[PDB]
Amino acid sequence: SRKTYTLTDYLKNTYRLKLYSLRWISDHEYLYKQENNILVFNAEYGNSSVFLENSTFDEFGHSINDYSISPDGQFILLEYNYVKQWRHSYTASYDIYDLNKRQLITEERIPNNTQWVTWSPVGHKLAYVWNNDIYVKIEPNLPSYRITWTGKEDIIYNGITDWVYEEEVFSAYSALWWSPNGTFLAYAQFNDTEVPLIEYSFYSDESLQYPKTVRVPYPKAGAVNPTVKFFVVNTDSLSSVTNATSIQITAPASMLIGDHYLCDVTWATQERISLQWLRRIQNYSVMDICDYDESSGRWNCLVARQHIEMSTTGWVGRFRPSEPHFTLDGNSFYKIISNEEGYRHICYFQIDKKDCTFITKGTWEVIGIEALTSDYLYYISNEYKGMPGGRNLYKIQLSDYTKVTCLSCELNPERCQYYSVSFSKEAKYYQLRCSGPGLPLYTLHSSVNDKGLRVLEDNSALDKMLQNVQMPSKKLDFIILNETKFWYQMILPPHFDKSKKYPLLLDVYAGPCSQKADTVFRLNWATYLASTENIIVASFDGRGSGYQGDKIMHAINRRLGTFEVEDQIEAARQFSKMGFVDNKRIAIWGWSYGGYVTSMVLGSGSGVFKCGIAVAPVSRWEYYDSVYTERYMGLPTPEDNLDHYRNSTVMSRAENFKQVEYLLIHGTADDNVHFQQSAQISKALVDVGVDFQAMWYTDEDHGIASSTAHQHIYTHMSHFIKQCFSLP
Amino acid sequence: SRKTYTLTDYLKNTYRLKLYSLRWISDHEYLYKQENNILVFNAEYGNSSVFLENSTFDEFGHSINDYSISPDGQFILLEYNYVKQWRHSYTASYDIYDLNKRQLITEERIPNNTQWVTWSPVGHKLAYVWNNDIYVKIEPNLPSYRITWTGKEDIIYNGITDWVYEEEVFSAYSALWWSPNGTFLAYAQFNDTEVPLIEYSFYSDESLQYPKTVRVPYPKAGAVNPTVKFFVVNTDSLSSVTNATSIQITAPASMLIGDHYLCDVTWATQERISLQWLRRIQNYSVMDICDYDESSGRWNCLVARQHIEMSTTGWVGRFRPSEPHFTLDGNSFYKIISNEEGYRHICYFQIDKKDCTFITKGTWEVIGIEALTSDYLYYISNEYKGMPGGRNLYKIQLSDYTKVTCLSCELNPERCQYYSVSFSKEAKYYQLRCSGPGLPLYTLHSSVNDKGLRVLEDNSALDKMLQNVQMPSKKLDFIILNETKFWYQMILPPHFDKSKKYPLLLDVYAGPCSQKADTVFRLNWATYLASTENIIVASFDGRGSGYQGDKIMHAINRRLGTFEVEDQIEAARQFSKMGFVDNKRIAIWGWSYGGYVTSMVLGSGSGVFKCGIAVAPVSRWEYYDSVYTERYMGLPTPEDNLDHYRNSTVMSRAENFKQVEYLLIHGTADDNVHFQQSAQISKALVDVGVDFQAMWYTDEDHGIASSTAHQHIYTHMSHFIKQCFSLP
Numbered sequence A, B: 001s002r003k004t005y006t007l008t009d010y011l012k013n014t015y016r017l018k019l020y021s022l023r024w025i026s027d028h029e030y031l032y033k034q035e036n037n038i039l040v041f042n043a044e045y046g047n048s049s050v051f052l053e054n055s056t057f058d059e060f061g062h063s064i065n066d067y068s069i070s071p072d073g074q075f076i077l078l079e080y081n082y083v084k085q086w087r088h089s090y091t092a093s094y095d096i097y098d099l100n101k102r103q104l105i106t107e108e109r110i111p112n113n114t115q116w117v118t119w120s121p122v123g124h125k126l127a128y129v130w131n132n133d134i135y136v137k138i139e140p141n142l143p144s145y146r147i148t149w150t151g152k153e154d155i156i157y158n159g160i161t162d163w164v165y166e167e168e169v170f171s172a173y174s175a176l177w178w179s180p181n182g183t184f185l186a187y188a189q190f191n192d193t194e195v196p197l198i199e200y201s202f203y204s205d206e207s208l209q210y211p212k213t214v215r216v217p218y219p220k221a222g223a224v225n226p227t228v229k230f231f232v233v234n235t236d237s238l239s240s241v242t243n244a245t246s247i248q249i250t251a252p253a254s255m256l257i258g259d260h261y262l263c264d265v266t267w268a269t270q271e272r273i274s275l276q277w278l279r280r281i282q283n284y285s286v287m288d289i290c291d292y293d294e295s296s297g298r299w300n301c302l303v304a305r306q307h308i309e310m311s312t313t314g315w316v317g318r319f320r321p322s323e324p325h326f327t328l329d330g331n332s333f334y335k336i337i338s339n340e341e342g343y344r345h346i347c348y349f350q351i352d353k354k355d356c357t358f359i360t361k362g363t364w365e366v367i368g369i370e371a372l373t374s375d376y377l378y379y380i381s382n383e384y385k386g387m388p389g390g391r392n393l394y395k396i397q398l399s400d401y402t403k404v405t406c407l408s409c410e411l412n413p414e415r416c417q418y419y420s421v422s423f424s425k426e427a428k429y430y431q432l433r434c435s436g437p438g439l440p441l442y443t444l445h446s447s448v449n450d451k452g453l454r455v456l457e458d459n460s461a462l463d464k465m466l467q468n469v470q471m472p473s474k475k476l477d478f479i480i481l482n483e484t485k486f487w488y489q490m491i492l493p494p495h496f497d498k499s500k501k502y503p504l505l506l507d508v509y510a511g512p513c514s515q516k517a518d519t520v521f522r523l524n525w526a527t528y529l530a531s532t533e534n535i536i537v538a539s540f541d542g543r544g545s546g547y548q549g550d551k552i553m554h555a556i557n558r559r560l561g562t563f564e565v566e567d568q569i570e571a572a573r574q575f576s577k578m579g580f581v582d583n584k585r586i587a588i589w590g591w592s593y594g595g596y597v598t599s600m601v602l603g604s605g606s607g608v609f610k611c612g613i614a615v616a617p618v619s620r621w622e623y624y625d626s627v628y629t630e631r632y633m634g635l636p637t638p639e640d641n642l643d644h645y646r647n648s649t650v651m652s653r654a655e656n657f658k659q660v661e662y663l664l665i666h667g668t669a670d671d672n673v674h675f676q677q678s679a680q681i682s683k684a685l686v687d688v689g690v691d692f693q694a695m696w697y698t699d700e701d702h703g704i705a706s707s708t709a710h711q712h713i714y715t716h717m718s719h720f721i722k723q724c725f726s727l728p
């Protein structure tokens, strides 16, 4: 008498997973948004006060997109007129509000089309980027000072990132870094002057007679890369009519000898900045420590003080070198590094000393350092029960490394196995977030004795609702390949009778350091295909996948479209042997990297698959960007790796496609994985006479996330899979 | 016969239609190529000697694309390195082979990347366009003379046409007109400085890292149009010292008050040129007869002797004011004109007297004037048996307008009802071309007494092959809606059964002055569909169609997307009725304007069609070019016809597509009907939640004519129709 999780349920969000997003405002309080009524919470006791009622601003004029309360609590930034650009960048209008005197500042307003704004870490200063130039406000109503004058669209970028850096380096549009004092303002400067431009047509509304051409500086594999510079401005010494003075911090000599990237920026203390540069050949990286010398007023980055981090098996770090976590005094820090056994662990570094010291060890990996105090270091790893797809919060007694405590392992063994944490400043408190295998559960904790303070959100409203639906179950196990464990998850149709034959959809990503087999709970497309269409949706992490050691993650070094492709097929094969999967009805599909892999598999000729769907997939590595691509493929030169670049295109496998049913999808406005890529694929198929299904999405980009487009693609895809499996 | 007409037959061109292309070189001889040999034939006796052997350019080095023998047969232009551009335009290299010797004039060679070349009507003079500038060579081995210096890519076009003129006006890349004498050289100049550019991505070869953006000056409905000037130069007076002086011939003052175009250029005599201008509001045109003043070296067009063409019911001409045929002395001429009752007949004009004299009348139309001797005017009409879809050659005795003879009606009644003709210069002979309903037949005739000299090609071979195959038959009938008769055709399956029920596909064009129903014989996709899949393929010429009077053709005036659409739906209702049509399986498909009509049809919610295929369809008239669009819709402004531009989009009907299975196809490199038009359609469907099938073709243009692309699309469409009609 129960219904099934239908496509519409997923498409129309019938079952809402609740969340609990707070922002620590101090060591003991946090802000939380409830019914548009911003509240302030006391962590210790749980009581609160409304900080700003929805009521306020009902006569503002425009819709408010986001809020940002200054560290002071005296002002609050009002963001509206939000126009999205890339994955993290966007532009918007801003207004400030004096809380001391319920008023909107009308004088010296932040300009329109501002690219980025940030309060200082303490107080109420402001720094913004308008027209690629950095401006600073000491007071909200006072006129701002101009820090840089070189800014110029699509060429010079100050305080903000260009395309690659936003996407592949900082996962952010910002390139501004305030000191903990608020005294200094460090910023990067990008220069795309010689960076080729990818161009594509944006059609826009019907009303538009002539389509428009978007031109973005985008460096494809091997092209000229943007260059970078770094500066630091003293915010307290800014006069009315006196251009501000930025002191540039050069990169190490080992980086300047060639192309290089700025990878990280971290303030150690009030007068010490940490910088990490990486070579274009992401083999070698160097952390730089620069101190402020009150004398000249310059910044020295002592050469002896440097720290090298290279790799012989592959690239450095998971996607970039790891971030350092300094001890309060700043003379030491902690950083996650690949050890001699190839596993990632916490290393302790002391500034004026050479080599570091590992604090953790084992056949598992530390995902990330979350908090640091004088007595403990808090991190998350997948040690518990040897599950790489599990996540847990641990404690390390700094005076005895052998004393490690798991803080989330036994809170809810049956329900919780994947955790992410959020510590208050100075780590007196911490919020745990469990996202599976059961419904998400948010809890507040005391740090002094690890006491559970209270449940913040347990999704019981969703639980009630779901007890009426026939939900699919998840199996997390592994298979063996040349004496190695490789995990896979299976989303099984409710009432899974392993004495029957079920069709199987292989959901793939399989990109460098990926992980599709894990313990998190999801309400997605696969949930539907399993609940209603009774299809088994499996995902496999083979060579290349991450969080299992460098031997597995680097197996694909300098050879994408190789072992990870083969392993997807081998997993699929062994799934067949299993007495519950119709080996005549096995499909595969993937988005982006998952789409390239899906194409590679369909064009392998294994005969293992009946059909496959590839969404906005890479087809030839020369078409993707320099940073991501080169990190694994090196350069596309004859001296370097040109042969394998040319040996791993989807096009070269066109002929084998005649053995399968292929559906190709792509948004015409994809700025990330250019339409060009799918364009070249279809042409390869047309040139060898192979028939296939196609579908473009006018003006959608990599995410094809516009409500209408989103429901459309998943509807289309469902039909394709239903027909490919002869399912009603 | 057992064997049927397969798709592979159509795509691989298994049963070829022989032909007989000849080029008349004089009053009684013509060239023809056998294999790779150019033979010259004598029309009177039929004897032929070899003019040039396939063994003359083996050691040439380049693959010869075409040849061009000069008037006095002394030289032969060799065309190679042919690189296509738009529909009629292209670039190529050339070499002149002197026949009076055994050499390739290697001195003053015609520059590479030449855009257009042409001999004079007499002798061996040579004019050519290069870099948008005109050059003239009196002798093939001599240094050419530059005629214009204003040439500027995409801006100033001298001697060649811009995109709109090439496609919608002169249907050719050339804008050069030699005078009979060979003395003068009139040319046109286009100024595209203020024309907007349509831009689209061209991905090219797999090796091209960044896609290339193509920009073509192209005016859409209501956009700024290219301007034009006319010139005439005396090529007898050309000194390599001083520059060649061009004389300009302004347009009629009644043309300069607003935008206008040049429509036709025809020389009457040695010193007389005929220029027809058209107002940007295509229902008013003025022909200009200009005479060369030998004393002032000028050209004067007495404003007194201008002729006016006007349309109250629509626009002028079928697609433009028809072409004049001057009597040898230049004092008069015949021109096809819509008479009082609205049918197009031959009119006789005497240069300095008002009005013209209709020398034909009837409820049928003159399709074209082909020749004009001192005693007879030859032309082709569809008078015979009141069949608009039939064509025949007629002769009118100039000294007694009532005496008209039919030169092809009775040649072979049951096999030939659609002729086209080619007269030898002076017209002593004429080659008649029979296109159907039977296999093509080519014959040579003498006009002295219209004696049939001989058969040139009768397709005996193709004929004997088809008897062995089970071919479909064609029915050319008509239905009556109100009180008017509208014709249609039907390609019926082999062994047709009036008691059996076959599915039906509606092949559609339906544009203004189109004719899909006729007596022509064709071997196409429709043949495959009826022969092998037993699908009835019917076409229908409803309102708007041509060759039947302005009552039917102008019905559509300023109202595209209405009657022509209704009439197609209607036709299908009637065919449904006919007891041999399964009203459960009726499909519709069209390309270009047919793509458009097919979409409107599918979006009307009529409930008649189950599925349909649209290829490179127009979606909204504001996206197509000005000259063709404005010709039927006027300007898209509020004071003009903007209301109907906005009420005739494929988009506004989106919702209705939920009731039909739709397949949308388009070449991404389409310069004619910009990919944009389909991109907006898909977005509308997606925005409204309608699932359809899609398919783009990277780098293909309006014709999707590359060998591989062409095969891929007709296969793709075949699977679609086969699956839409539950066909085994």
Ligand SMILES: CC#CCn1c(N2CCC[C@@H](N)C2)nc2c1c(=O)n(Cc1nc(C)c3ccccc3n1)c(=O)n2C
Pocket (backbone or CB within 6 Å): A167, A168, A319, A509, A511, A591, A592, A593, A594, A618, A624, A628, A673, A702, A703
């Ligand atoms: C090309 C390429 C690529 C590589 N890639 C990256 N990075 C590392 C960080 C920076 C980025 N530049 C490159 N992140 C990824 C992927 C990826 O393929 N998929 C599969 C996937 N799966 C699904 C279901 C997706 C759905 C929508 C959009 C993308 C999707 N992608 C991912 O999920 N994530 C999170």
Ligand SMILES: CC#CCn1c(N2CCC[C@@H](N)C2)nc2c1c(=O)n(Cc1nc(C)c3ccccc3n1)c(=O)n2C
Pocket (backbone or CB within 6 Å): B167, B168, B319, B508, B509, B511, B590, B591, B592, B593, B594, B618, B624, B628, B673, B702, B703
């Ligand atoms: C947009 C538009 C348009 C209108 N149009 C024109 N003209 C008039 C003269 C000037 C020109 N600019 C516009 N000629 C046409 C069409 C047309 O739609 N189809 C259907 C069709 N059908 C098939 C099967 C086709 C196949 C390939 C290419 C085109 C095709 N077209 C035609 O066959 N012909 C010959």
Ligand SMILES: CC(=O)N[C@@H]1[C@@H](O)[C@H](O)[C@@H](CO)O[C@@H]1O
Pocket (backbone or CB within 6 Å): A029, A040, A041, A042, A045, A047, A048, A049
């Ligand atoms: C967020 C909040 O309301 N905190 C209040 C605090 O201001 C007050 O001093 C205390 C005693 O009543 O109760 C809570 O802790």
Ligand SMILES: CC(=O)N[C@@H]1[C@@H](O)[C@H](O)[C@@H](CO)O[C@@H]1O
Pocket (backbone or CB within 6 Å): A093, A109, A110, A111, A112
């Ligand atoms: C600081 C500033 O630029 N203010 C103007 C505002 O006065 C105007 O109403 C708006 C138009 O949307 O453009 C800006 O926001």
Ligand SMILES: CC(=O)N[C@@H]1[C@@H](O)[C@H](O)[C@@H](CO)O[C@@H]1O
Pocket (backbone or CB within 6 Å): A150, A156, A191, A192, A193, A194
């Ligand atoms: C602000 C800045 O440093 N601009 C430089 C520019 O002067 C130089 O000519 C160019 C050459 O690549 O590189 C950068 O764009």
Ligand SMILES: CC(=O)N[C@@H]1[C@@H](O)[C@H](O)[C@@H](CO)O[C@@H]1O
Pocket (backbone or CB within 6 Å): B150, B156, B191, B193, B194
């Ligand atoms: C050769 C020629 O006619 N050039 C004209 C130029 O004189 C004029 O200023 C412009 C205005 O659109 O159009 C063209 O560029």
Ligand SMILES: CC(=O)N[C@@H]1[C@@H](O)[C@H](O)[C@@H](CO)O[C@@H]1O
Pocket (backbone or CB within 6 Å): B149, B241, B242, B243
């Ligand atoms: C012989 C002579 O005067 N030649 C000139 C040429 O140099 C100049 O570039 C052109 C444009 O004004 O006009 C003439 O063709």
Ligand SMILES: CC(=O)N[C@@H]1[C@@H](O)[C@H](O)[C@@H](CO)O[C@H]1O
Pocket (backbone or CB within 6 Å): A035, A036, A037, A053, A054, A055
């Ligand atoms: C528009 C809006 O947010 N309204 C909410 C209302 O639903 C809620 O019941 C109330 C309780 O404080 O708070 C208001 O802000």
Ligand SMILES: CC(=O)N[C@@H]1[C@@H](O)[C@H](O)[C@@H](CO)O[C@H]1O
Pocket (backbone or CB within 6 Å): B040, B041, B042, B047, B048, B049
């Ligand atoms: C085209 C051709 O070859 N015509 C020749 C002609 O030159 C010659 O005068 C005649 C008499 O022998 O024989 C014909 O065959």
Ligand SMILES: CC(=O)N[C@@H]1[C@@H](O)[C@H](O)[C@@H](CO)O[C@H]1O
Pocket (backbone or CB within 6 Å): B109, B110, B111, B112
């Ligand atoms: C008349 C002339 O310029 N001919 C040259 C030809 O010799 C050369 O082979 C070709 C490209 O290699 O370019 C042509 O323009």
